[PDB]
Design a binder for this molecule. Structure first.
Ligand SMILES: OC[C@H]1O[C@@H]2OC[C@H]3O[C@H](O[C@@H]4[C@@H](O)[C@@H](OC[C@H]5O[C@H](O[C@H]([C@H]2O)[C@@H]1O)[C@H](O)[C@@H](O)[C@@H]5O)O[C@H](CO)[C@H]4O)[C@H](O)[C@@H](O)[C@@H]3O
Ligand SMILES: OC[C@H]1O[C@H](OC[C@H]2O[C@H](O)[C@H](O)[C@@H](O)[C@@H]2O)[C@H](O)[C@@H](O)[C@@H]1O
Ligand SMILES: [Ca+2]
Ligand SMILES: [Cl-]
Ligand SMILES: [Cl-]
Ligand SMILES: [Mg+2]
Ligand SMILES: [Mg+2]
Ligand SMILES: [Mg+2]
Ligand SMILES: [Mg+2]
Ligand SMILES: [Mg+2]
Length: 1060
């Protein structure tokens, strides 16, 4: 016998076990305890046994029996039997061959547990800023205490002390209590908390009485798992949930946006590519938002399992782990708010606000693992320029020596001792990187910023490399690693990524200062702009111990955020414009930069999953989210996937392309120029350009939304139910979302699809590309070829943009971040709307713009505040008869060139139905009024057409053309028309041409028929308007124009306008 081995918890992995563990790891009462033991080599005459005590009394030895052999080893099972709650078992496993050398493992101790639950509230003590509920338990001899406090008047905090020896924290005092013999009610202006005393049971209501959530119907819902003497290993609570409740968030989730029916694990993990299928994630957060208008946050870094109607149909539960410490209270919050986004804001009050990033973060980020030398970088920059791709972000991954990870590849130097930091001058730069500072300089010269890839582990694959060995030596001697629980440094389990490597203990300030000081020259001298801090999901083992005294169970989820946050703050301390780009974290991750969805494939299935990950991450407070556009590996994406992915990426929080392969032939770059090369489809380039340029045109709206995230907790990209939680059609949507406050984006995420369903909530929605109007409250069908993305503006939207003199979306404005070309505000008038623009170009002043729609009196008014730049309003309406600024008429410009050369004026874009109004910069409010205007036209060519087509051969039409002829039976044009101001009579203007003879058409208004006369126009190049009286009602009015048997003559139908 060369050895024996048993270790009850193995690596403490949630998904797998080592072959020498105890099962169950933590025995409960009535569970059979099995010890898996190994001996080597495989040899006859081996004896394996267990020496042990139960409650301090020696037991008869238990003999192990063989299980199987594998490799050089024999595996055995020793059966200890079942135990009762309270039993303390201590054991040593032993092996020997023929009475000789006994080898052993242990001693190991476990305490047998069982569940104890809250029974009744015996007394209530109101301390003014906290309330204590003294309770009885269903079993055992504890005297538990549940403390209630208010983090705010709409945010309830519960802290449970099973033994009653701990005390909860103070909160707000603005509550009242109505305590009676059978019940206690705690009320604030936002919540009503009703608590039955016997048995204890809590219901959380809004002040108006509406139920938010409640503990399970049978009570005894709240519990702890204990042996009654030494340990508390888990906590649980159970709640009632009706069949229709939807549950969002839980960190970044790849399988579904609605976790109803799932057992959700709060456990960070590095799962390569099949995150959806395994239901795993790098970024896990114990916070969810329910469409029933509340969120719940379990405040603990230990692993938890959320059982969302996965066991019993009307029950959800959380089971939270603990390390045994009986003084650790259960601490969770039930979070209300003014709306769903305010619930997220309240959550970030507790766990941390998003840190506003510099504007460069919101441009295109270019990346490819294959970029591994200076010539690759100069080529990327030249290709970007040759293809008119003004990106703002650049990433290097394969930049280092691949040993120390803070030294440029090929650099030579005099190896240092004692972890002393190098300076740029210490190195002689060779081969792939002859001048790193110059390389960096060239990136900045192109208007981009660079980040370098990092890991939180000191590599140790057993190979010899002088400087790495020097650092490992120093790190261990300073106690800069975490401890394995025996005085030795913690190493990542062997079979994992960076197996055998030593983690830097990021809880240890001195260790962090040392680790970062090795990277300092990169920021102070080389001039980088941040780090792509990869990995973090590397803490295994229960006995793993950190300088803060916490161990592995508690630190696994926290470690990656301690790591990311440590680098983020460090980089920023030296360079205020620095940005981190990471993948792993837990609650609080949002404070430290960008999170991307990790490693996926270039397929539509993966694209769908990526969108689910961004939507769930959003609800969980991680707003600055990215993904590898079109996937980073697998067979190269098809032109169709690359085009569909580019569209979505451009209308996402962070836009970034990337690829896995280190030295492929041909190139695996997910760049647009390489995509053209690989697919042979040259049309990819102008489509990518269109989207990238549109994003840059929208950068003012995007960056303002980025600031709203930081200040008010509203994520940039949001699942539909975050804005419409009561809308039954919005609950499960995962192929569209809101972007900023006012844009609805509906990416085509299915292969071969061109008929896109888009669910439109209540109100009016306008296609931002062409001015097509879509009343809300139904699912429409939008024809989207491979180059097209449905995007719609909400009623009342005010959207800042940076336009060229062309003034259309999709025109290249460049990547200048320090000035605007033509600062423009796109407006869709609807009642009174306001917007606060973040003018970062001019010191970050908030510009409060308001708009007052008054179509009933043919007017739209804009109150423009003082600005530092010339402004152009683009207002969706019919053509004005006049426009005033401060009561003085501004000049009408007949052409766009004339509009551009003017200092002030107005111009009507006939194709887009937009009135441009130009105002000069002034240190004073300016009152703009558009007179004689009506709601924009409903274009006939955008209507639902039956057996009739469009044309554009006779000039003077609005929109893109008109419906041509429309002169045969069963030919029809149907509009979806909104009442401008509620149910009422209105005048409908019908614009047409009838160059040959008088005509008539039949019109149906919500089923009510009338015939209209359309007299002859001078010729087909002459348009006329006819006014028809209609009665419209609230919502969507179906207005169908038909050519019936008694109708006559051909016309060209331009549009209809609704007015008073
Ligand atoms: O050759 C010139 C002529 O060609 C097309 O039609 C010939 C069409 O003429 C007479 O009928 C038309 C009918 O089709 C419809 O026309 C509307 C259409 O008019 C112009 O285009 C016609 C073509 O249809 C063109 O002049 C115009 O440019 C276009 O924009 C309009 O949509 O309705 C008119 C009025 O009732 C009718 O006169 C003729 O009766 C028929 O035999 C012949 O096929
Ligand atoms: O939102 C309106 C409309 O947008 C697209 O169609 C625009 C398209 O409509 C007609 O075919 C005109 O003749 C063209 O000039 C326009 O480009 C969507 O495909 C459609 O579904 C949507 O309703
Ligand atoms: Ca038209
Ligand atoms: Cl007209
Ligand atoms: Cl009517
Ligand atoms: Mg699906
Ligand atoms: Mg609040
Ligand atoms: Mg290369
Ligand atoms: Mg700098
Ligand atoms: Mg009004």
């Amino acid at each position: 016998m060369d050895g024996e081995y048993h270790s009850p918890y193995g690596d403490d992995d949630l998904y797998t076990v080592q072959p020498t563990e105890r099962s169950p790891r933590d025995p409960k009462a009535g569970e059979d305890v099995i010890l898996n033991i190994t001996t080597w080599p495989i040899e006859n005459g081996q004896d394996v046994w267990v020496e042990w005590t139960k409650n301090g009394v020696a037991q008869e030895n238990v003999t192990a029996a063989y299980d199987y052999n594998s490799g050089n080893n024999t595996y055995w099972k020793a059966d200890l039997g079942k135990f009762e709650k309270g039993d303390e078992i201590t054991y040593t496993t032993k092996g020997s061959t023929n009475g000789g050398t006994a080898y052993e493992s242990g001693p190991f101790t476990f305490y047998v547990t069982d569940w104890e639950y809250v029974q009744d509230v015996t007394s209530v003590v109101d301390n003014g800023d906290s309330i204590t509920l003294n309770m009885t338990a269903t079993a055992g001899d504890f005297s538990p205490k549940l403390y209630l406090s208010f983090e705010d008047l709409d945010t309830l905090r519960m802290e449970l002390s099973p033994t009653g020896k701990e005390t909860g924290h103070a909160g707000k005092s603005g509550y009242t209590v109505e305590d009676t013999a059978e019940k206690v009610t705690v009320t604030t202006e936002d919540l009503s908390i009703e608590i039955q005393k016997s048995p204890y049971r809590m219901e959380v209501h809004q002040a108006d009485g509406t139920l938010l959530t409640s503990e399970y119907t049978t009570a005894n819902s709240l519990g702890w798992l204990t042996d009654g003497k030494n340990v508390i290993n888990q906590y649980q609570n159970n709640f009632m949930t009706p069949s229709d409740e939807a549950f969002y968030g839980f960190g970044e989730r790849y399988d579904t946006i609605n976790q109803r029916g799932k057992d959700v694990e709060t456990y960070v993990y590095n799962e390569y590519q099949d995150q959806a299928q395994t239901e795993r994630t790098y970024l896990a957060v114990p916070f969810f938002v329910s469409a029933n208008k509340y969120g719940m946050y379990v405040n603990s870094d230990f692993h938890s399992q959320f059982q969302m109607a996965s066991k019993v149909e009307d029950k959800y539960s959380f089971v939270l782990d603990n390390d045994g410490d009986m003084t650790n209270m259960l601490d969770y919050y039930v979070i209300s708010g003014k709306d769903q986004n305010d619930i997220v804001n309240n959550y970030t009050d507790i766990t941390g606000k998003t840190t506003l990033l510099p504007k460069w973060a919101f441009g295109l980020w270019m990346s490819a693992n294959e970029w591994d030398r200076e010539s690759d970088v100069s080529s990327a920059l030249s290709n970007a320029k040759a293809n008119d791709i003004p990106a703002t972000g650049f990433v290097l991954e394969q930049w280092s020596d691949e040993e120390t990870y803070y030294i440029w590849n090929n650099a030579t130097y005099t190896a240092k001792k004692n972890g002393e930091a190098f300076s740029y001058d210490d190195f002689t730069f060779n081969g792939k990187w002859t001048d790193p500072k110059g390389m960096v300089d060239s990136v900045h010269d192109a208007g981009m910023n660079i980040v370098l890839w990092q890991v939180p582990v000191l590599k140790d694959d057993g190979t010899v490399y002088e400087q790495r060995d020097n650092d490992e030596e120093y790190m261990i001697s300073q106690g800069y690693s975490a401890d394995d629980g025996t005085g030795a440094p913690y190493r990542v389990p062997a079979s994992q990524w960076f197996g055998n490597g030593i983690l830097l203990d990021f809880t240890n300030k001195d260790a962090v200062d040392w680790w970062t000081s090795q990277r300092e020259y990169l920021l102070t001298e080389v001039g980088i702009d941040g780090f792509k801090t990869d990995g973090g999901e590397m803490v295994w083992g229960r006995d793993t111990t950190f300088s803060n005294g916490e161990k592995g169970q508690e630190m696994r989820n926290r470690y990656p955020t301690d790591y990311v946050s440590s680098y983020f703050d460090f980089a920023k301390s030296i360079n205020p414009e620095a940005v981190s780009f990471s993948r792993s974290g837990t609650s609080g991750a949002q404070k430290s930069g960008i999170y991307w969805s990790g490693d996926q494939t270039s397929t539509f299935d993966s694209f769908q999953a990526s969108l689910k990950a961004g939507l769930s991450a959003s609800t969980s407070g991680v707003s600055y989210w990215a993904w590898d556009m079109a996937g980073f590996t697998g067979d190269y994406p098809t032109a169709e996937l690359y085009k569909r992915a580019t569209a979505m990426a451009a209308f996402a929080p962070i836009m970034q392309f990337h690829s896995e392969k280190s030295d492929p032939s041909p190139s695996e770059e997910r760049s647009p120029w390489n995509a053209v090369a690989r697919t042979g489809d040259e049309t990819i380039l102008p489509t990518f350009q269109k989207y990238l340029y549109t994003r840059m045109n929208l950068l003012p709206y995007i960056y303002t939304a980025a600031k709203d995230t930081a200040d008010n907790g509203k994520s940039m990209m949001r699942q539909m139910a975050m804005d419409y939680p009561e809308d039954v059609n919005a609950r499960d949507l995962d192929e569209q979302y809101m972007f900023g406050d006012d844009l609805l984006v509906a990416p085509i995420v299915q292969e071969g699809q061109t008929e896109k369903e888009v669910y439109l909530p209540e109100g009016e929605w306008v296609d931002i590309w062409n001015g097509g109007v879509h009343p809300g409250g139904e699912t429409i069908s939008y024809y989207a070829d491979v180059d097209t993305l449905p995007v719609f503006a909400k009623a009342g939207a005010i959207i800042p943009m940076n336009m060229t003199d062309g003034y259309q979306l999709g025109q290249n404005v460049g990547n200048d971040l320090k000035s605007y070309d033509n600062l423009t505000f796109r407006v869709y008038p609807s009642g009174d709307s306001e917007y606060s623009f973040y003018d970062d170009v001019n010191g970050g002043e908030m510009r409060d713009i308001s708009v007052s729609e008054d179509f009933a009196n043919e007017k739209v008014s804009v109150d423009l505040p003082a600005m530092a730049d010339e402004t152009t309003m683009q207002v969706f309406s019919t053509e004005p008869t006049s426009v005033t600024i401060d009561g003085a008429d501004v000049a009408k410009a007949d052409t766009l060139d004339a509009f551009n050369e003017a200092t002030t004026g107005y111009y009507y874009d006939t194709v887009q139905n937009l009135t441009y109004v130009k105002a000069a910069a002034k240190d004073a409010k300016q009152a703009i009024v558009l007179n004689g205007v009506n709601h924009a036209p409903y274009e006939a060519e955008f209507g639902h057409l039956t057996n009739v087509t469009t044309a554009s051969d006779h000039a003077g039409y609005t929109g893109t053309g008109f419906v041509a002829g429309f002169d045969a039976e069963k030919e029809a044009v149907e509009f979806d028309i909104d009442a401008v101001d509620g149910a009422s009579d209105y005048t409908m203007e019908v614009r047409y041409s009838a160059g040959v003879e008088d005509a008539t058409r039949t019109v149906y208004i919500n089923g009510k028929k009338q015939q209209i006369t359309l007299p002859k126009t001078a010729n087909w190049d002459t348009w006329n308007t006819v006014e028809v009286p209609v009665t419209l009602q609230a919502g969507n009015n179906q207005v169908v124009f038909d050519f019936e048997a008694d109708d006559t003559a051909g016309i060209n139908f331009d549009h209809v306008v609704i007015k008073k």
